[PDB]
Design a protein around this motif. Structure first.
Motif, PDB file in Angstrom:
ATOM      1  N   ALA A 114      39.663  14.910  14.332  1.00 61.13           N
ATOM      2  CA  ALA A 114      38.817  13.837  13.824  1.00 61.13           C
ATOM      3  C   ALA A 114      38.993  12.566  14.643  1.00 61.13           C
ATOM      4  O   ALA A 114      38.012  11.882  14.958  1.00 61.13           O
ATOM      5  CB  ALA A 114      39.128  13.575  12.352  1.00 61.13           C
ATOM      6  N   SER A 115      40.236  12.230  14.993  1.00 64.04           N
ATOM      7  CA  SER A 115      40.477  11.036  15.798  1.00 64.04           C
ATOM      8  C   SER A 115      39.870  11.174  17.187  1.00 64.04           C
ATOM      9  O   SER A 115      39.293  10.217  17.715  1.00 64.04           O
ATOM     10  CB  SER A 115      41.975  10.759  15.892  1.00 64.04           C
ATOM     11  OG  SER A 115      42.667  11.870  16.433  1.00 64.04           O
ATOM     12  N   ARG A 116      39.993  12.354  17.798  1.00 64.49           N
ATOM     13  CA  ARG A 116      39.476  12.542  19.148  1.00 64.49           C
ATOM     14  C   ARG A 116      37.961  12.696  19.178  1.00 64.49           C
ATOM     15  O   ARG A 116      37.340  12.427  20.210  1.00 64.49           O
ATOM     16  CB  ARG A 116      40.130  13.762  19.797  1.00 64.49           C
ATOM     17  CG  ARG A 116      41.624  13.632  19.990  1.00 64.49           C
ATOM     18  CD  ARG A 116      42.185  14.845  20.703  1.00 64.49           C
ATOM     19  NE  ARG A 116      43.623  14.735  20.901  1.00 64.49           N
ATOM     20  CZ  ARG A 116      44.354  15.610  21.577  1.00 64.49           C
ATOM     21  NH1 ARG A 116      43.811  16.679  22.135  1.00 64.49           N
ATOM     22  NH2 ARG A 116      45.662  15.409  21.692  1.00 64.49           N
ATOM     23  N   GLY A 117      37.353  13.113  18.074  1.00 67.92           N
ATOM     24  CA  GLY A 117      35.949  13.464  18.077  1.00 67.92           C
ATOM     25  C   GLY A 117      35.661  14.898  18.448  1.00 67.92           C
ATOM     26  O   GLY A 117      34.544  15.197  18.881  1.00 67.92           O
ATOM     27  N   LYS A 118      36.629  15.795  18.299  1.00 66.30           N
ATOM     28  CA  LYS A 118      36.490  17.187  18.698  1.00 66.30           C
ATOM     29  C   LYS A 118      36.533  18.100  17.479  1.00 66.30           C
ATOM     30  O   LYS A 118      36.898  17.694  16.374  1.00 66.30           O
ATOM     31  CB  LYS A 118      37.594  17.579  19.688  1.00 66.30           C
ATOM     32  CG  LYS A 118      37.683  16.688  20.913  1.00 66.30           C
ATOM     33  CD  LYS A 118      36.411  16.748  21.738  1.00 66.30           C
ATOM     34  CE  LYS A 118      36.490  15.815  22.933  1.00 66.30           C
ATOM     35  NZ  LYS A 118      35.245  15.844  23.745  1.00 66.30           N
ATOM     36  N   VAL A 119      36.138  19.346  17.697  1.00 64.06           N
ATOM     37  CA  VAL A 119      36.249  20.378  16.665  1.00 64.06           C
ATOM     38  C   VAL A 119      37.701  20.842  16.590  1.00 64.06           C
ATOM     39  O   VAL A 119      38.301  21.135  17.635  1.00 64.06           O
ATOM     40  CB  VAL A 119      35.315  21.544  16.969  1.00 64.06           C
ATOM     41  CG1 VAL A 119      35.676  22.754  16.126  1.00 64.06           C
ATOM     42  CG2 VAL A 119      33.880  21.141  16.712  1.00 64.06           C
ATOM     43  N   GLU A 149      34.021  21.928  25.421  1.00 68.02           N
ATOM     44  CA  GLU A 149      34.416  20.862  24.510  1.00 68.02           C
ATOM     45  C   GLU A 149      35.375  19.861  25.137  1.00 68.02           C
ATOM     46  O   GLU A 149      35.527  18.758  24.604  1.00 68.02           O
ATOM     47  CB  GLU A 149      35.056  21.454  23.252  1.00 68.02           C
ATOM     48  CG  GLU A 149      34.112  21.582  22.066  1.00 68.02           C
ATOM     49  CD  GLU A 149      32.999  22.584  22.300  1.00 68.02           C
ATOM     50  OE1 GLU A 149      33.213  23.547  23.065  1.00 68.02           O
ATOM     51  OE2 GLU A 149      31.909  22.406  21.720  1.00 68.02           O
ATOM     52  N   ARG A 170      33.006  16.018  29.555  1.00 75.49           N
ATOM     53  CA  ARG A 170      32.295  14.841  29.081  1.00 75.49           C
ATOM     54  C   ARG A 170      30.830  15.194  28.872  1.00 75.49           C
ATOM     55  O   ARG A 170      30.214  15.846  29.723  1.00 75.49           O
ATOM     56  CB  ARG A 170      32.428  13.679  30.065  1.00 75.49           C
ATOM     57  CG  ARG A 170      32.046  12.343  29.464  1.00 75.49           C
ATOM     58  CD  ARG A 170      32.808  12.105  28.173  1.00 75.49           C
ATOM     59  NE  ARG A 170      32.290  10.964  27.429  1.00 75.49           N
ATOM     60  CZ  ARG A 170      32.644  10.656  26.190  1.00 75.49           C
ATOM     61  NH1 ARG A 170      33.521  11.385  25.521  1.00 75.49           N
ATOM     62  NH2 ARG A 170      32.103   9.592  25.605  1.00 75.49           N
TER      63      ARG A 170
END
Lengths: 101, 890, 199, 124, 100
Positions: free
Chosen positions: D38-43, D57, D60
């Motif tokens: 969640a912090s990184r913006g990833k699954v 993923e 960029r």
């Protein structure tokens, strides 16, 4: 949903209260006092009892109950509430008071 | 879920005649004037200060006006100004003026209405457009200035930007460019805002090459591309359906351009991530970006931000994301941002993705009450909610209860068809997504029928007929064009029907003829169809589709890969069956060709050798040997093989025929007659926890027995029975709690019961304690023999309270989709429901009628419940007279 | 639903009417008249069979009707509908002219209504008492000692039975050999887990 | 899990309260994979699993027009090319009928003029 | 028929069978069916359709086929030209329509 149903019930209570009729004002006042003092409502006890009876009733009896109560604005009661009320132990002091009276 | 008319009716029914009397504050004012106000009540002491207090309290939810006074929109709506600008641009394009002094009067194209002009402009720092030298260009500039002044725009850089933007929005890119070039040649500097106005034309159409060429031209003209220009480039890529390009442009703008993003930039990025599908982390990226904007940048989310975020969050069926969407809507309404059509659309999307028809109907009813008129999209997503609910039906529980889902499917289909009928009655122009939703519903109904009731061919045929009728007639009845989603739905139906030829025909027609891009769902459907098909080369064609996706840019997902592996492993069974069928056919042919063509106890040396004694002729092993030796050969059981590459004998009819030919009468004629041990709820638990309850179920000869030890102790019969009884007690506790049905009457239970109970059970034939309770509580239903009547004989009374407006609307099944005017016309159709239309408007009108004496309202609560057990009876007593007046004829 | 409820009400009312009529006339099954009526009905059924073969008894119908009417007349069973039609009409028409007479008629009617309500309370009390007492009697009779079985002749299987059952024994042995028809034998009783073969 | 405790630096190494406090502090300072993603913006699943689609993923987010080679008039989406979106096994028959005109339709000179002749005879 | 996306070769085979059996009107109907199904007309289909149409004397069919072939700019064959000139002279359709 329960809050909406209770809001309708208390709208009925308020209609009885603000009406002007002496008997309606008195019954609304006593209902309000019981609610403010936390006294339980007999209607909820009746609902729990009839829900358990409907749960344990046979086809004909449960069909009769459902068709008779299809139009009554009964609350949506989960089976957990009925189980809790049924499993609550009886008050022996109240039983003694009732039998003595 | 009620219409405002029925809500007002229920309001008056609950409040009696008190509803139309003075309000609570009026009563309090009267009591205060009388001096009898109770101490606990807050007294209305000062009117002005009370008004100020209430206004201060109400100010926190007051909505800020977000109206935009778009000068470009005003120019667009000014039709005469638009045509004047168009004719000026056409003149400037076809016959551009000349920079000669005495050409204005000579030229009839631009009729009029020493010191060098360029030298004067250079000396006094003034544009050449403001110079009047009776030139052709001067006349053109004066005409343009007059037209812009008539429209309402000054002949300056900002006015030129506005007019070029207004032109570019309504096409006319060449005319806008001509006006831009004329301004540049007349000296009004071609600013970055003018370049953005030019770029608007390419952004609306999505010409990526044109937008990039415009950016390069602006750079070459010595003008820095500004944040608006980068926004237009991002919008161009978004409209060209290259969504990751928007994020790439944002990153490059932050790094190289060094431009701090604003709220518009964040909204564009949120939209791009909402519609992005190149990476699986688009939703986490959007959520993190929203948090970053809220916290680090310090911006405050507006309606565009909230709408974009809710639209993105209403796409995933995860309950956490649905909760996030609901929290965002609640915060929006708390911050003084009233919900609108887009907000309700996002809420309906969030409900429909998970399949909550109740939530969708609640949202529709709330929207109707709040007066936002429902649009076509809301009904389309309600139909999608019905589709998703049909998908989410618990078919496992339905099978366990032995309940047909066909009535539920028919109910959903008829509800959606009623919605379609309402749409065509309202006169709304039919939208393609509505017909696509209907087609998806029909295809999904067919698929679910095939998956859940493979034997009931009639309903499957009806569903397929409805789907085919829709696909063949509705689209060209409403003059609509089939799209990628409609093709996806129909191709999915064909794939599930395993009509690979027709599926591929439609697929390649869509690709080559109509020039459409198949969706990733369509690609998945094709891959799964080919994988499930057991024919040779199916996985090769599936990999062909997968590599087509890879080289076309379609997203490849780990879920897709896992499902590919699983489906291939599953279809291995069908592949094996076809491979065996080939050799079966070969062996049958060889057998037919062969048919057409046509000392026990002494060894080789002569010594007498031992021979086993003959087995018992009555033994089951001898019976099996004789049956195998004397039954028909396996090659003559079936001549023709199965319809699809597989040997016959899988269906129960073929199995029964084969057993009959072998001389065996199958006791399990039907599929349901098989015991189906997967429905067991008690034995698997015992086997899982304690051990094999049976014990001697698998015993060869005095061995493989699952029984407790003889000695006893911790592993003895007593402990085993105690643990089994504890498990049975847990199951009975579940039964009492209602998670399981009440069991029937057993022999042991009857023998335990009292004599009266046994006698009445025997004389009534009751099978369940519920039937016993019915027998004891309904003596009238007893036959003279003592047996109880079937339940159908009893007909319970029907109270008239079910005929109330709200009671009949609760089970209407179409009222949430019906508009309030339709319900009012259906129910009353008189002046009493004439009147926007709202519950409070109805209340005001009815209060006026009561004060004028044209309405009779019974004093006291007409509808009573929640206070006394005998409240419905009092409701009926109060409603009997009205029911009789309504029902009688005069 | 309302139509079903109304039909159920009418059917139950008719059932209660016929049941109470049978209860009241349970004693009309008297042998002298019963024999005559049975003979007449046998003659009527013979006439009906003759009519069916074709495809009077009216005098017999009239005789049975007269017998039934005379039996009803001598039993003189009370008719509640007749009481309502007679008493109320008589008092109304007799005391309509006099206001005080009609007032005393009204008060007598009120007294009768109060007596009727008390009677219905006693009726529900009686029904509840009957049900409870019958249930309690059954519970008490749970401890009833069982009946004493009468003795029969000694059990024995005769050679005639063996000879007549030889073919059945062979067929049941063949069925037992067959894994499919083993459970579908005619005579296959088991004491605990062992089937009793035909002797 | 695996836990290693070192209390040598403490004044009293034999301290059960020190042990439990250190273990609980280490547990408290732990971030879950869901929180990290969640912090990184990833699954979260694309952080501990070896699936080759997950490789996209960690790059960029950049435009597909830029990633794929350009077309004839400029940038083009890869989904707009039939030779890309159409599987190879289905490029026979109707595809040939559609694309016949790209080779065998045009002007009379374009269809009849031989382009494989001498082109320098005049100069010679 | 309605399962595989049939192409010009298959429709030309059907036309050849019809013309061999002598049903030139049937061949023209097959050409119309192919046009309805959307499969484009290739030069071999055009040549065979012109032969069949101008043998069967279907002036409107010949007009439509020739106009579509001219619009699509397919290279006309010797067989097509020789089977076209027959009706072009007999019906004078090109002469009266000023069509070349």
């Amino acid at each position: 949903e329960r809050l909406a149903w209770l809001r309708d019930v208390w709208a009925q209570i308020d209609a009885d209260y603000r009406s002007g009729d002496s008997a309606r004002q008195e019954t609304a006042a006593q209902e309000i006092s019981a609610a403010l003092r936390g006294e339980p409502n007999d209607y909820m006890r009746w609902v729990y009892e009839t829900k358990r009876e409907l749960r344990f009733a046979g086809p004909v009896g449960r069909r009769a109950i459902q068709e008779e109560l299809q139009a009554a604005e009964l609350p949506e009661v989960l089976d957990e509430e009925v189980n809790r009320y049924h499993d609550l132990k009886l008050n022996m002091m109240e039983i003694e008071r009732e039998v003595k009276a | 879920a009620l219409s405002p008319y029925a809500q007002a009716l229920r309001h008056v029914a609950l409040r009696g005649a008190t509803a139309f009397g003075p309000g609570a504050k009026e009563m309090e004012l009267d009591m205060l004037r009388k001096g009898t106000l109770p101490a606990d009540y807050r007294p209305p002491v000062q009117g002005r200060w009370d008004d100020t207090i209430e206004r201060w309290a109400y100010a926190w939810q007051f909505p800020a006006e977000e109206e935009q006074d778009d000068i470009t929109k005003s120019v667009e709506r000014n039709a005469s100004g638009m045509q004047a600008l168009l004719e000026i641009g056409n003149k400037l394009l076809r016959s551009p003026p000349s920079p000669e002094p005495l050409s204005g009067k000579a030229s009839k194209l631009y009729p009029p209405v020493r010191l060098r002009a360029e030298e004067l402009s250079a000396k006094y720092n003034v544009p050449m457009a403001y110079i009047d030298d009776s030139s052709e260009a001067s006349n053109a500039s004066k005409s343009l200035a007059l037209v812009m002044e008539d429209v309402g725009l000054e002949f300056t850089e900002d006015g030129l930007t506005v007019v070029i933007s207004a032109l570019s929005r309504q096409g006319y890119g060449t005319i806008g460019r001509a006006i831009f070039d004329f301004a540049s040649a007349m000296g009004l500097g071609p600013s970055a805002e003018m370049y953005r106005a030019l770029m608007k034309y390419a952004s609306r159409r999505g010409d990526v090459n044109e937008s990039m060429a415009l950016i390069e031209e602006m750079k070459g003209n010595g003008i820095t591309p500004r944040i608006g220009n980068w926004h237009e480039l991002m919008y161009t890529f978004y409209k060209a359906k290259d969504y990751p390009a928007v994020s790439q442009i944002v990153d490059n703008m932050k790094m190289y351009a060094n431009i701090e993003p604003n709220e518009v930039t964040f909204v564009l990025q949120l939209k791009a991530l909402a519609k992005d599908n190149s990476q699986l982390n688009s939703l986490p990226e959007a959520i993190q970006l929203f948090d970053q904007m809220e916290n680090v940048y310090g911006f405050i989310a507006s309606r565009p931000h909230y709408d974009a975020m809710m639209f993105h969050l209403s796409q995933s069926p995860r309950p956490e994301m649905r909760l996030r969407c609901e929290e965002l809507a609640h915060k929006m309404e708390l911050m003084g941002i009233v919900w609108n059509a887009n907000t309700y659309l996002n809420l309906i999307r969030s409900a429909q993705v998970v399949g909550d028809v109740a939530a969708v109907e609640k949202y529709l009813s709330r929207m109707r009450e709040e007066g936002i008129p429902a649009s076509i999209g809301h009904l389309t997503w309600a139909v999608q909610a019905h589709v998703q609910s049909m998908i989410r039906i618990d078919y496992d529980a339905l099978k366990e209860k032995d309940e047909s889902p066909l009535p539920t499917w028919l109910e959903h289909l008829e509800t959606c068809f009623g919605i379609y009928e309402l749409v065509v009655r309202r006169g709304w122009v039919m939208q393609l997504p509505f017909v696509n939703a209907l087609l998806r519903l029909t295809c999904q109904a067919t698929i679910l029928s095939m998956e859940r009731t493979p034997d009931e061919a009639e309903t499957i045929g009806r569903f397929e007929e409805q789907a085919n009728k829709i696909w063949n007639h509705t689209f060209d009845e409403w003059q609509l064009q089939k799209d990628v989603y409609s093709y996806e739905c129909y191709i999915a139906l064909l794939a599930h029907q395993q009509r690979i030829d027709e599926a591929e025909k439609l697929f390649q027609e869509m690709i080559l003829k109509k020039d459409l891009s198949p969706s990733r769902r369509t690609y998945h459907c094709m891959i799964f169809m080919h994988l499930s098909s057991g024919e040779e080369g199916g996985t090769a064609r599936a990999l062909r589709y997968l590599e087509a996706m890879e080289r076309a840019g379609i997203q490849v997902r780990p879920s897709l890969l896992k499902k590919i592996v699983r489906v291939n492993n599953a279809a291995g069974y069908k592949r094996d069956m076809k491979r065996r069928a080939r050799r079966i056919m070969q062996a049958r042919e060889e057998y037919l060709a062969r048919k057409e063509e046509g000392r026990a106890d002494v060894d080789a040396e002569g010594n007498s050798i031992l021979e086993p004694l003959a087995v018992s002729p009555t033994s089951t092993l001898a019976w099996w040997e004789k049956w195998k030796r004397e039954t028909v050969s396996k090659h003559e059981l079936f001549t023709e093989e199965g319809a699809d590459g597989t040997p016959k004998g899988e269906t129960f009819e073929e199995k029964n025929e084969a057993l009959r030919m072998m001389g065996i009468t199958s006791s399990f004629q039907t599929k349901d007659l098989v015991p189906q041990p997967d429905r067991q709820k008690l034995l698997p638990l015992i086997r899982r926890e304690e051990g094999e309850i049976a014990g001697s179920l698998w015993a060869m000869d005095g061995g493989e027995l699952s029984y407790p030890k003889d000695g006893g102790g911790p592993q003895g019969w007593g402990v085993r029975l105690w643990r089994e009884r504890q498990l049975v007690k847990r199951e009975y506790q579940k039964v009492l709690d209602g998670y399981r049905p009440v069991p029937q009457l057993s022999t042991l239970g009857n023998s335990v019961r009292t004599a009266g109970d046994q006698l009445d059970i025997e004389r009534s034939g009751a099978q369940t304690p519920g039937e016993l309770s019915d027998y004891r509580n309904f003596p009238d239903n007893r036959f003279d023999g003592g047996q109880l009547k079937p339940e159908s004989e009893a007909a319970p009374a029907v109270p008239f309270s079910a005929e109330l407006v709200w009671q009949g609307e609760a089970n209407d099944k179409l009222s949430p989709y019906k508009s309030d005017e339709e319900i009012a016309l259906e129910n009353d159709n008189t002046f009493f429901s004439s009147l926007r239309r709202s519950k409070f408007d109805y209340l005001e009108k009815w209060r006026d009628m009561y004060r004028h004496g044209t309405l009779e309202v019974p004093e006291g609560p007409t509808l009573n419940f929640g206070r006394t057990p005998d409240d419905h009876k009092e409701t009926m007593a109060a409603l009997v007279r009205g029911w009789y007046q309504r029902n009688r004829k005069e | 639903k309302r139509l079903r409820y109304l039909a159920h009400m009418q059917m139950e009312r008719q059932i209660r009417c016929v049941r109470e009529n049978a209860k009241l006339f349970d004693g009309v099954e008297n042998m002298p008249e019963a024999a005559q009526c049975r003979e007449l009905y046998e003659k009527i059924m013979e006439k009906k069979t003759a009519q069916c073969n074709m495809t009077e008894a009216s005098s017999l119908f009239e005789k049975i009707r007269e017998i039934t009417l005379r039996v009803i007349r001598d039993r003189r069973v009370q008719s509640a509908a007749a009481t309502k039609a007679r008493m109320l009409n008589r008092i109304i028409r007799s005391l309509k002219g006099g206001e005080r007479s009609i007032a005393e008629e009204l008060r007598a009617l009120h007294q009768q209504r109060k007596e009727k309500m008390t009677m219905r309370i006693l009726g529900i009390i009686e029904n509840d008492v009957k049900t409870e007492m019958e249930w309690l009697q059954n519970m008490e009779e749970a401890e009833r000692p069982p009946l004493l079985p009468i003795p029969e002749n000694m059990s024995y299987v005769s050679a005639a039975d063996v000879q007549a059952w030889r073919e059945l024994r062979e067929d049941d042995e063949r069925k037992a050999a067959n894994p499919f028809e083993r459970r579908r034998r005619t005579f296959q009783p088991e004491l605990l887990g062992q089937a009793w073969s035909v002797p | 899990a695996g836990c290693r405790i070192n209390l040598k630096a403490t004044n009293n190494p034999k301290s059960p309260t020190h042990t439990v406090e250190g273990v609980f502090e280490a547990v408290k300072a732990l971030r879950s994979v869901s929180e990290i993603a969640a912090s990184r913006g990833k699954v979260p699943h694309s952080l501990i699993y070896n699936i080759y689609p997950y490789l996209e993923e960690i790059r960029r987010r950049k435009g597909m027009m830029a990633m794929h080679p350009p077309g004839k008039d400029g940038l083009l989406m890869p989904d707009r090319v039939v030779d890309n979106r159409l599987p190879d096994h289905l490029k026979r028959g109707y595809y040939d009928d559609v694309y016949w005109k790209d080779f065998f339709a045009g002007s009379d000179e374009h269809l009849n003029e031989p382009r494989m002749g001498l082109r320098g005879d005049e100069m010679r | 028929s309605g399962k595989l996306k049939l192409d010009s070769i298959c429709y030309l085979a059907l036309i050849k069978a019809k013309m061999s059996r002598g049903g030139y009107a049937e061949a023209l109907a097959v050409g119309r069916e192919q046009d309805a199904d959307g499969v484009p007309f290739l030069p071999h289909t055009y040549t065979h359709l012109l032969e069949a149409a101008e043998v069967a004397d279907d002036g409107e069919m010949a007009l439509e086929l020739a106009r579509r072939m001219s619009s699509e700019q397919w290279p006309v064959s010797d067989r097509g030209r020789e089977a076209l000139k027959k009706l072009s002279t007999r019906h004078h359709w090109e002469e009266v329509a000023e069509y070349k």
